[PDB]
């Protein structure tokens, strides 16, 4: 009855966006590890909008 | 009242499933009884009161 | 506020392995869909239609299509909206000239007897419906009134013309006549002239003859090719075994329509067990031909599913002869008296007949 | 994704067992999701309460400030009650899991518990277990009752204190209805967020904990990274820097070469297979893995990995169906006598949370899934210890040789089965972490030290 | 009040939905609590009329035919095999026809079958299920263990420790549990009994049987047991027939089944080949071949 969810909510695209945030913050900045601060700022940067 | 329901229903269910034929259990899915003994007992003992 | 769904975010994994309710099993028993229903009304639901404006541009197709109560709503509301809009304009213009102010002076009003919006609306009635009550005259005073009178007259004539056209094309409809053609609820298979054929019966009720009648006949079944080309609805045409070679039919009495099952016919591998309740198979019978009076071409769609096909029965002879003229007893229309016949397939029957004939000769 | 790229050292898998990771993926993600649900509350409800209090003063005066102060003073107390409630809830959860495991153990063996007339023993045990769980439930029920009491009885107390103070301690206004009823409406629209800002803070603490747990999980050593297996040194380790597993290993195996191996009591049999597999940190070695960049290495181990599904799904392993290879594999393992009495044969709920099986039956399952895929290499591992059916052993060996060696399907059988202890191909004998030579069997008989 | 009518309606509907789901849980609970065991019953005065504990242990099969559904088919049909009191009679005929049925018929697993049986000169259908299994011993076909006191694992009711259990241990070969396990008898089972043996099942069964003061001993086949475990088990069966003066067994492997004092063949619910002397069993090649 319910069906495949729209493009924006598909887990593949959400994972792609979160990887983009992680890569962008780990590359433009110089922080090889991914600590609590890094993950927290990553979620905010990818879902603030 | 929720506490009283939890205690008495649990002990009654234990007693009845004890005095039960094992031919039924060989027919019973053997997980259906486990479900309705863990999940449902949890619901009536932790959510029906509130 | 007052719910406890957010207090506990934890979970327990002790309870699992819950399945086999057997409730959905009964749901799968629901009957499959028919292509075209018995009383026409094809049961196909188009999906992802990109409208692109092709469902408003052909307005005058829609107006004829709509039902009579909806058509009368459009009728009434077209006229009343026109009347009221032009009444507004008459009110405003006769107010601008001052003719609405009571006892203004001896200035000749540009439309007499305008003493309200109520009289303005009545004046719009008189003008557009072309009734012309003498109370509300159009004087020669202001040019804008004469212009608006011309415009309202032309618009009223155009609206009358449009509604006349739609009423013309609606009073000559066909779907009030397509339903007065009668088929059997179920069709039969039986041997005629030693060859297996798929009979059927169709009749007419109204005395009005149906001219240039035409009976197409198709089989609807999912079917694959040797190349793997899978067609979900691979319609196949079927000749009507009519002696002349055309498919036309002269329909007065209830006639027996059938297709002789030769090697070409796609029903060449049917068995009495091969047409059971849930078998995927469906016959369509398109009965075309115009109505004699209005000269409007019509169709009479109908279908026959597998669970309606019945083996080895013959239609009861319906026509009798009264004292002076023939008799048609439509109560025996769809009655199919039992008749024994070989229960093998069409291919097995053909091969057996050929072998027996070769051995005999 | 970081489950995939993760390494399987005993420093990782010996601490965060499958229970830990399942608890993480479910509980931690759930509570992080809940924090993202409630995030706007911790921003708004400050403004909500502040604006409500300020214009409550404007509507009525100081007395409204006093009532709001009473609610705010009782907020930390209600937080304490709710936190103690959560502690009791975790205690009850632990006791409930204990009782559920006890009842799983009990109800499993109902056959011998009823035949031997032994209902009394475990009935008493469960009775005592439920006694302790009932004490915990009493504490939980008492604490949640206090929460309900405070939740539904602070607004009345706030209203009571406000109006009585206004009348007596203030005696300022006549309290016309325009002020009284406005204030009561404000009390509703303030009690709803005031009583819940505490819970938002609670979820904030929990979310910080969840990100701690997730970050720790994300801060473990994970990524280790012609002739099929061409090795020079082969010295790999388990620990990413040190703790070597082996040294001085070298093979060069052409296709179809059933290069069986030997070993000792847990001495470099599966460890050799794993170091080859690529899941060990290779320190002193150089391998150029290439195909006739890797290949779909069929594999297994001592404890078979299974899918909690039906047996058909657990054997096919996400691939098409072909009856010839299917029948050949299920006969060379003799899968039909094994699944004779399972309630629907293939359709049975094999795996955990369901059908419990024996070592030999699970061993047939693993070997079938490994062989069936129709691939170029196969690394079986010890399928003949728990499954020691001699007739099945001969059948499995005949199938192994004829099928695997013909289609070039290398079957590296590293085990200790005597009936073909001398393999039909290349052999290599390992002991105490040293393996002499990987060549033919003629030089192995030439050495003549490991005589049966 | 009109301001609050809104969320009152909302939460009333929502909490109604949650109450509906949890009441479905209660409905399933009562589905379990609507199963009634027919077999458990009492029809006789047990204060003095029955014997305190059966001693003779007479056995007879008065054509006992067992049908659980009582409509499809039975498992035994007109079986009449006389077990000699003091001499074991264990026959591996049609495996899924006679041995499971007989064990189920003695011990109330099948307490509803056409025809009856005299247990120690007394009909068994006039006694409670727990009484019917009170003074009788049996083993299983598969192993099952869990955490719990070994003393209560063997004798939960009687609880005669060290006098019998150590003697029960003596027949067993569990040397390690005495010292390798943490405490042994006073200690509970560890890791759910996944660290001791596949012979722990047989050892516990023998310990319970000797601690039941077995008026009758029943056995079963083996799933995967050590050869030393089989030798000790069979030897202790002989010694239990020596002291407790009763033994009866069953098996499925042809050669192991032949390692018995008596044997027969029972197929298709009825009797196939019965000879009182065991020599005729060897004389019949076809019947012996039937098993394997
Ligand atoms: C490459 C060349 C392309 C073409 C280039 C042409 C260049 C021309 C230059 C511009 C002139 C165009 C003037 C049009 C302005 C009005 C358009 C309009 O109302 O009709 C819009 C639509 C459809 O028509 P279209 O899409 O324009 O078609 C023309 C084109 N060739 C095409 O077919 O795409 O029409 C409808 O969809 C009408 C629906 C009819 C429904 C009946 C009720 C009418 C409502 C109004 C009256 C209601 C009754 C009340 C009376 C009140 C009295 C005031
Ligand atoms: C519950 C919601 C469901 C929504 C689904 C769709 C809604 C459909 C509504 C169906 C029920 C309507 C009841 C209307 C009662 C009067 C009907 C009436 O006069 O028509 C009589 C006949 C036609 O018969 P029909 O049953 O309408 O046939 C329609 C059919 N479906 C078809 O397509 O064939 O008509 C003719 O064959 C024409 C003869 C006309 C002769 C005289 C003219 C009378 C009307 C003139 C206009 C008066 C307007 C007054 C407006 C005043 C405003 C102040
Ligand atoms: C079935 C139907 C006929 C109904 C006719 C309209 C009745 C409204 C009554 C009314 O007050 O009308 C008013 C118009 O009022 C407007 O101008 C309203 C405009 C309404 C447009 C349509 C809305 C639907 C009338 O106002 P008036 O014409 O300015 O009155 C003249 C004043 N004098 C008479 C004192 C000189
Ligand atoms: C599945 C949960 O997804 C939701 C998520 C929300 C957002 C939300 O603030 N929730 C918590 C609040 C915090 C303080 C726990 C809550 C839970 C239970 C009852 C009421 C409330 N408060 C809701 C806001 C107004 C005051 C009372 C709403 C509704 C839903 C929903 O079921 O659709
Ligand atoms: N969903 C749709 N509903 C109605 N017409 C459609 C739909 N999709 C396509 N068509 C029509 O089918 C024809 C060919 O469509 P097709 O899908 O083959 O190509 P297309 O890329 O959509 O074409 P175009 O650029 O001409 O619209 C066109 O006339 C197009 O308008
Ligand atoms: N005499 C008739 N008048 C009108 N419609 C008829 C008549 N005979 C058949 N039909 C039509 O044929 C279809 C069959 O329906 P119905 O079940 O009433 O008839 P039947 O089973 O063919 O039997 P019979 O011919 O005895 O009426 C319907 O669409 C029905 O309207
Ligand atoms: N799961 C494991 N992860 C990491 N290292 C391991 C693991 N299991 C064993 N080891 C290490 O590898 C060494 C060699 O183990 P090996 O691969 O020979 O065992 P095995 O094949 O499972 O043994 P066996 O089949 O005789 O029980 C062990 O002594 C231990 O130090």
* Residue with the two structure tokens 């051995």: C359
Cβ separation D34–C13 shorter than 8 A: no
> CA of E47: how far to CAs of D120, E52, E122, E128, in Å?
21, 9, 16, 13
Angle E127-E130-E131 (CA atoms, 0-180°, nearest 5)?
Answer: 45
Burial class of E216 by CB neighbour count within 10 A (0 to 12, 13 to 18, 19+): buried
In this structure, are residues C110 and C141 in contact, taking their beta carbons and an 8 Å threshold?
yes
Buried b (16+ CB within 10 A) or exposed e, E251-282: beeeebbeebebbbbbeebbbbbbbeeeeebe
How many helical (H) and strand (E) elements, i.e. helices and strands, does chain A have? Answer: 2, 0
CA distance C344 to C261: 14
The neighbouring-strand residues paired with D230 are D252
Helix, strand, coil percentages for chain D (3-state, nearest 5): 60, 10, 35
Question: Under 8 Å CB-to-CB from E7, ≥6 apart: which residues?
Answer: C1
Which residues of chain C does D353 touch, with a Cβ-Cβ cutoff of 8 Å? 16-17
Selected residue of E15, E25, E29 to mutate for chain C interface (largest C Cβ count, 10 A): E15
Interface of A with D in 6-45 (CB under 8 A): 15, 33-36, 39-40
Query: Least CB-CB distance to B37: which of D103, D137, D148?
Result: D103
Half-sphere exposure of C109 (CA within 13 A, CB side): 23
- The owner of tokens 């329509």 is C257
Q: Which chain D residues are within 8 Å of B18, Cβ to Cβ?
A: 119, 123
- CA dist., res. D236 & res. D243, Å (int): 9
Atom number in ligand 4 closest to CA D199: 14
CA dist D271 and D245 (Å) reads: 7
Of the candidates D391, D372, D380, the residue with the CA atom closest to the CA atom of residue D415: D380
DSSP code at position C98: T
Neighbour tally for D431: CB within 10 Å: 13
Cα D204 from chain centre: 25
Residue C290 forms beta bridges with which residues?
Answer: C211, C297
Cα E234 to chain centroid distance, Å, stands at: 18
What values do phi and psi take at D252, rounded to 5? Answer: -150, 95
Per DSSP, which regions of E120-244 are E strands?
A: 122-123
Q: How far apart are CA C329 and CA D342, in angstroms?
A: 65
> With contact defined as beta carbons under 8 Å apart, do E32 and B36 qualify?
yes
d(CA D338, CA D336): 5
CA distance E92 to E221: 10
Six-digit token string for A39: 């993950």
Residues 6+ apart with CB under 8 A from B36: E25, E28, E29, E31, E32
CA distance C355 to E146: 76
Resolution in units of Å? 3.9
D215/D212 Cα distance (integer angstroms) = 5
Calpha distance C342→D304 (Å, rounded): 60
User: How crowded is the C-beta side of D374, counted as CA atoms within 13 Å?
Assistant: 11
Number of H helices, E strands in chain E: 11, 6
Q: What's the rounded Cα separation, in Å, for the pair C233 and C250?
A: 31
C227–chain D nearest CA distance, Å: 21
Q: Please, are residues C228 and C293 in contact by the beta-carbon 8 Å criterion?
A: no
Return d(Cα C318, Cα C101) in angstroms, integer.
82
Shortest-distance atom of ligand 3 to CA C101? 36
Please give the helix or strand (H or E) that residue E248 lies within, else none.
Answer: none
CA distance E61 to E103: 12
Spatial separation of the C-alpha atoms in residues D217 and C50, rounded to whole Å: 50
Q: Write out the H or E segment, with its range, that includes residue C60.
A: helix C59-65
For residue E38, what are the CA distances in angstroms to B16, C291, E110, E128?
12, 76, 11, 11
Residue D396 has, within 13 A of its CA and on its CB side, a CA count of: 25
CA C189 to chain centre: 29
Cα E105–chain centre separation: 11
C-alpha D385: how far from chain center: 28
Point out which residues pair with C299 in neighbouring strands: C288
Q: How far apart are CA D97 and CA D90, in angstroms?
A: 11
Q: How many CB atoms lie within 10 A of CB D182?
A: 16
Instruction: At E184, give phi and psi (nearest 5°).
Output: 95, -115
Here the tokens at position C236 are 């196949």
* C-beta C345 within 6 A of ligand 1: no
Q: How far is CA C58 from the centre of its chain?
A: 18
- Give the number of whichever ligand sits closest to the CA of residue C205: 6
- CATH number of the domain bearing residue C86: 1.10.287.70
Q: How many CB atoms lie within 10 A of CB E71?
A: 6
CA-closest candidate to residue D97, choices C151, A7, B39, C180: B39
In angstroms, rounded to a whole number, what is the distance separating the alpha carbons of residues B31 and C17? Answer: 6
Q: Identify the bridge partners of residue D381 per DSSP, sorted by sequence position.
A: D414
Q: Where do the DSSP E strands lie in D189-264?
A: 235-237, 260-261
Length of chain C: 361
Non-local CB neighbours of D324 within 8 Å, separated by 6+ positions: none
CB C249 within 8 Å of CB C257: yes
Chains that touch B (3 or more CB pairs under 8 A): C, D, E
Q: Name the residue of chain B whose CA is nearest to D133's CA.
A: B7
The neighbour count for residue D73, using CB atoms within 10 Å, is 9
| Alpha-carbon distances of E182 from D321, E177, E186, E189, E207, rounded to whole Å | 52, 8, 9, 9, 20
**C247: which 2 tokens?**
């498919």
Strand-pair category, C210-219 with C236-237: antiparallel
Cβ contacts of residue C43 below 8 Å, gap of 6+? C33, C34, C35, C36, C37
Contacts with C150 (C-beta within 8 Å, 6 or more apart), sequence order:
none
Q: Say if CB C215 and CB C257 are below 8 A apart.
A: yes
Phi-psi region of D117 (alpha: psi -120 to 50; beta: other; left: phi over 0): left
Measured CA to CA in angstroms, residue D2 lies from A22, D9, D18, D23 at distances of 14, 15, 14, 16
Residue C29 CA to its chain's centroid (Å): 29
Would you say D395 and D330 are in contact if contact means Cβ atoms under 8 Å apart?
no
User: Measuring CA to CA, how many Å separate E162 from each of D394, E12, E135?
Assistant: 47, 64, 21
Q: Are E160 and E74 in contact (CB under 8 A)?
A: no
SS3 of residue D247 by DSSP: coil
- Can you give the three-state secondary structure of chain B, one letter per residue? CHHHHHHHHHHHHHHHHHCCCHHHHHHCCCCHHHHHHHHHHHHHHHCCCC
Closest CA to E81 of E54, E117, E32, E37: E117
From C5's Cα to the closest Cα of chain B, the distance in A is 10
CB atoms within 10 A of CB D308: 15
Residue E137: count other Cβ atoms within 10 Å of its Cβ.
26
Taking the C-alpha atoms of residue D440 and residue D9, their distance in angstroms, rounded to an integer, is: 34
Close Cβ partners of C282 (under 8 Å, ≥ 6 residues apart):
C34, C35, C219, C220, C221, C303, C304, C305, C306
* Tokens standing for residue A6: 């729209």
Residue D427 backbone dihedrals phi, psi, to 5 degrees? -135, 160
Q: What is the DSSP string of C139-180?
A: -SS-HHHHHHHHHHHHHHHHHHHHHHHHHHHHHT-SHHHHTT
Which one of E34, E35, E103 makes the best mutation probe of the B interface by having the most chain B beta carbons within 10 Å? E35
- Per-residue DSSP letter, E160: -
Å from CA of D267 to ligand 7 middle: 7
Q: D377-379 and D410-411 as β-strands: parallel, antiparallel, unpaired?
A: parallel
- DSSP code for E126: G
Which residue in chain B is spatially nearest to D352 when comparing CA positions? B31
Q: Which of C188, C247, C238 is nearest to C214 (CA)?
A: C247
CB neighbours of residue E174 within 10 Å: 21
Are D371 and D378 in contact, with CB atoms under 8 Å apart? yes
Nearest CB to A39; choose among D1, D36, D214: D214
Which helix (H) or strand (E) is D410 found in, with range?
strand D410-411
Rounded Cα distance between B19 and E108, Å, is: 12
Burial profile D373-398: b = 16 or more Cβ within 10 angstroms, e = fewer: beebbbbbbbbbebbebeebbeebbe
Q: Give chain A's radius of gyration (CA, Å).
A: 13
Token pair recorded at residue E187: 């200690």
Taking alpha carbons only, the member of D220, D224, D217, D174 closest to residue D60 is: D174
In 3D space, the residue among E60, D278, E27, C219 whose CA is nearest the CA of residue B40 turns out to be: E27
Residue E260 CB partners (closer than 8 Å, separation 6+): E88, E90, E249, E251, E278
Q: Identify the CA nearest to A35 among candidates D35, D1, D212, D5.
A: D212
Distance of CA C51 to CAs C45, C46, C55, C56, E109, Å?
15, 12, 6, 9, 71
Residue E47, annotated ligand binder?
no
- Asked if residue C222 lies in contact with residue C280, where contact means CB atoms within 8 angstroms, the answer is yes
CB C128 within 8 A of CB C149: no
Which residues make beta-bridge pairs with C283?
Answer: C219, C304
Pairing of strands C210-219, C282-291: antiparallel
Secondary element (H or E) of residue D80: helix D62-108
State the virtual CA torsion across E190, E193, E194, E195 in degrees, nearest 10.
60
Show the tokens assigned to C59: 């307005």
Nearest alpha-carbon partner for D228 in D428, D413, D408, D427: D408
**Residue A45 neighbours by CB distance under 10 Å:** 16
Long-range pairs of C168-175 with CB within 8 A, sequence gap ≥ 24: C169/C60, C169/C64, C170/C64, C170/C68, C170/C71, C172/C294, C172/C296, C173/C64, C173/C296, C174/C291, C174/C296, C174/C297, C174/C298
Complete edge-to-edge strand list for the sheet that includes strand C310-311: C259-260, C195-198, C188-192, C310-311
From residue C144, alpha-carbon distances to C109, C128, C141 in Å are: 13, 17, 9
Identify any residues that bridge with E113 across adjacent strands, giving them in sequence order. E66
Nearest residue to C19 (alpha-carbon basis) of D370, B31, E212, D279: B31
Tell me, using a 6 A CB cutoff, whether residue D265 lines ligand 7. Answer: yes
Q: Is C333 in the pocket of ligand 6 (CB under 6 A)?
A: yes
Q: State the Cα–Cα distance between residues C109 and C98, nearest whole angstrom.
A: 8
Tokens encoding D368: 């079938």
Contacts of E55 (CB under 8 A, 6+ apart): E120, E215
Given the DSSP bridges, would you call strands E122-123 and E265-267 parallel, antiparallel or unpaired?
unpaired
Q: Are the CB atoms for D404 and D346 separated by under 8 Å? A: no
Q: Which domain holds residue C114?
A: 56-175
Please state, in angstroms and rounded to a whole number, the distance separating the CA atoms of residues D70 and E47: 71
Nearest to D381 by CA among D271, D317, D302, D305: D302
DSSP codes joined into one string, D342-389: STTGGGSEESSSSB---HHHHHHHHHHHHHHT--SEEE-B-TTSS---
Q: Determine whether D401 is exposed, middle or buried from the number of CB atoms within 10 Å of its CB (0-12, 13-18, 19+).
A: middle
Integer angstrom CA distances of residue D264 from C53, C78, D415: 80, 98, 10
Q: Alpha-carbon distance C219 to C206, whole Å?
A: 29
Q: Quick one: angle between helices B32-46 and B2-18, nearest 10?
A: 160
Q: Please give the distance, rounded to the nearest whole angstrom, from the Cα atom of residue D302 to the centre of ligand 7.
A: 10
Which residue from C344, C204, C175 is spatially nearest to C270, judged by alpha carbons? C344
């Amino acid at each position: 009855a319910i069906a495949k969810l729209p493009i924006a909510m598909r887990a593949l695209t959400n994972y792609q966006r979160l990887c983009v945030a992680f890569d962008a913050q780990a590359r433009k900045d110089t922080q090889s590890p991914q600590g609590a601060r890094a993950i927290w700022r990553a979620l905010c940067h990818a879902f603030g909008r | 009242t929720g506490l009283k329901v939890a205690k008495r229903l649990h002990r009654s269910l234990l007693n009845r499933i004890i005095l039960a034929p094992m031919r039924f259990f060989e027919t019973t899915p053997l997980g259906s009884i486990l479900n309705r003994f863990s999940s449902d007992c949890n619901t009536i003992d932790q959510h029906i009161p509130s | 506020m007052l719910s406890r769904k957010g207090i506990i975010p934890e979970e327990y994994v002790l309870t699992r392995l819950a399945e086999d309710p057997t409730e959905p099993r009964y749901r799968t028993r629901e009957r499959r869909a028919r292509f075209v229903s018995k009383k026409g009304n094809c049961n196909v639901a188009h999906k992802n239609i990109r409208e692109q404006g092709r469902f408003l541009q052909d307005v005058f197709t829609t107006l004829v299509d709509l039902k009579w109560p909806h058509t009368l709503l459009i009728f009434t509301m077209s006229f009343l909206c026109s009347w009221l809009l032009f009444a507004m304009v008459w009110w405003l213009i006769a107010f601008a000239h001052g003719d609405l102010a009571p006892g203004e002076g001896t200035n000749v009003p540009c439309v007499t007897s305008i003493h309200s919006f109520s009289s303005a609306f009545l004046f719009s009635i008189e003008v557009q419906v072309t009734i012309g009550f003498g109370g509300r005259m159009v004087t020669e005073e202001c040019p804008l009134a004469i212009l608006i009178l011309i415009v309202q007259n032309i618009v009223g004539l155009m609206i009358n013309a449009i509604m006349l056209g739609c009423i013309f094309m609606k009073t000559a409809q066909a779907h009030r006549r397509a339903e007065t053609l009668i088929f059997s609820k179920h069709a039969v298979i039986t041997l005629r002239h030693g060859r297996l054929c798929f009979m059927l019966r169709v009749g007419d009720l109204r005395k009005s003859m149906i001219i240039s009648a035409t009976i197409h006949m198709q089989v609807v079944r999912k079917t694959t090719s040797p190349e793997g080309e899978v067609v979900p609805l691979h319609q196949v045409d079927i000749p009507m075994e009519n002696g002349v070679g055309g498919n036309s039919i002269f329909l007065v009495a209830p006639l027996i329509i059938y297709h002789v099952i030769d090697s070409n016919s796609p029903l060449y591998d049917l068995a009495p067990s091969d047409l059971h309740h849930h078998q995927d198979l469906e016959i369509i019978v398109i009965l075309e031909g115009v109505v004699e009076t209005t000269g409007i071409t019509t169709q009479a769609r109908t279908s026959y599913l597998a669970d309606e096909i019945l083996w080895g029965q013959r239609f009861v002879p319906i026509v009798a002869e009264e004292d002076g003229r023939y008799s048609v007893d439509y109560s025996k229309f769809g009655n199919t008296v039992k008749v024994p016949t070989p229960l093998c397939t069409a291919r097995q029957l053909d091969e057996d007949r050929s072998l027996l004939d070769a051995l005999t000769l | 994704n970081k489950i995939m790229h993760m390494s399987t050292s005993n420093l990782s898998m010996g601490e965060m067992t499958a229970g830990q990771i399942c608890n993480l993926v479910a509980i931690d993600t759930n509570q992080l999701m809940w924090f993202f649900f409630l995030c706007p509350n911790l921003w708004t409800m400050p403004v909500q309460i502040i604006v409500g209090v300020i214009l409550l003063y404007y509507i009525l005066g100081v007395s409204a400030l006093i009532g709001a102060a009473v609610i705010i003073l009782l907020a930390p107390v209600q937080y304490f009650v709710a936190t103690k409630l959560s502690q009791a809830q975790r205690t009850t959860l632990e006791h409930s899991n204990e009782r559920l495991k006890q009842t799983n153990e009990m109800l499993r063996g109902m056959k011998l518990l009823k035949l031997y007339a032994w209902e009394s023993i475990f009935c008493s045990r469960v009775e005592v277990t439920r006694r302790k769980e009932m004490t915990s439930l009493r504490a939980f029920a008492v604490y949640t009752s206090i929460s309900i009491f405070m939740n539904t009885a602070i607004p009345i107390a706030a209203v009571l204190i406000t109006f009585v103070g206004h009348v007596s301690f203030f005696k300022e206004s006549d309290l016309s209805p325009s002020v009284a009823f406005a204030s009561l409406s404000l009390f509703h629209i303030l009690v709803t967020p005031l009583f819940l800002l505490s819970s938002v803070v609670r979820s904030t603490v929990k979310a910080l904990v969840s990100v701690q747990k997730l970050s720790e999980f994300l801060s473990s050593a994970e990524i280790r990274e012609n002739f099929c297996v061409q090795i020079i040194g082969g010295f790999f380790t388990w620990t990413p820097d040190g703790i070597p597993t082996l040294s001085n290993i070298t093979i060069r195996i052409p296709r179809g070469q059933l290069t069986m191996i030997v070993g000792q009591v847990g001495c470099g049999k599966s460890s050799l297979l794993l170091a080859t597999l690529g899941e060990m940190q290779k320190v002193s070695g150089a391998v150029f893995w290439n195909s006739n960049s890797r290949g779909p290495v069929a594999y297994a181990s001592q404890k078979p990995w299974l899918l909690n599904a039906t047996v058909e799904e657990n054997i096919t392993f996400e691939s098409p169906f072909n009856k010839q290879r299917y029948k050949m594999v299920i006969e060379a393992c003799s899968l039909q006598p094994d699944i004779d009495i399972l309630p629907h044969g293939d359709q049975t709920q094999i795996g955990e949370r369901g059908i419990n099986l024996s070592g030999g039956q699970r061993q047939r399952i693993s070997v079938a899934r490994a062989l069936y895929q129709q691939t170029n290499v196969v690394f079986l591992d010890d399928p003949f210890s728990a499954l020691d059916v001699h007739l099945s052993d001969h059948l499995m060996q005949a199938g192994i040789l004829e099928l695997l060696r013909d289609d070039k399907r290398t079957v590296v059988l590293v085990t200790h089965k005597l009936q073909y202890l001398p393999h039909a191909d290349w052999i290599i004998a390992m002991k105490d972490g040293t393996i002499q030579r990987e060549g033919t069997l003629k030089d192995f008989q030439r050495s003549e030290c490991q005589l049966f | 009040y009109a301001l609050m009518v809104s969320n009152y309606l909302n939460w009333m509907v929502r909490n109604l939905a949650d109450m509906e789901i949890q009441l479905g849980a209660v409905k399933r609970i009562h589905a379990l609590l609507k199963t009634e065991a027919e077999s458990y019953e009492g029809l006789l005065a047990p204060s003095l009329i029955p014997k305190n504990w059966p001693d003779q242990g007479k056995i007879q099969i008065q054509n006992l035919s067992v049908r659980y559904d009582s409509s499809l088919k039975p498992v035994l049909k007109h079986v009449n095999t006389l077990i000699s009191p003091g001499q074991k009679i264990g026959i591996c005929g049609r495996t899924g026809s006679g041995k499971s049925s007989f064990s189920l018929a003695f011990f109330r697993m099948v307490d509803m079958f056409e025809g009856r049986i005299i247990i120690d000169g007394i009909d068994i259908a006039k006694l409670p299920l727990h009484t019917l299994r009170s003074r009788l011993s049996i083993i299983l076909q598969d192993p099952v263990l869990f955490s719990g006191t070994i003393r209560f694992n063997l004798d939960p009711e009687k609880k005669c420790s060290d006098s019998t259990l150590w003697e029960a241990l003596e027949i067993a070969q569990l040397k390690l549990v005495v010292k390798a396990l943490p405490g042994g008898l006073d200690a509970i089972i560890t890791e759910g009994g996944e660290n001791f043996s596949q012979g722990q099942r047989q050892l516990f069964c023998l310990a319970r049987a000797f601690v039941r003061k077995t008026s009758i001993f029943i056995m079963d086949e083996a799933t995967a047991s050590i050869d030393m475990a089989t030798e000790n088990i069979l030897q202790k069966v002989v010694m239990t027939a020596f002291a407790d003066r009763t033994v009866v067994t069953i098996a499925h492997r042809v050669h192991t089944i032949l390692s018995a004092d008596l044997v027969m063949v029972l197929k298709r619910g009825a009797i196939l080949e019965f000879d009182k002397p065991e020599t005729l069993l060897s004389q019949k090649d076809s019947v012996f071949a039937s098993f394997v």
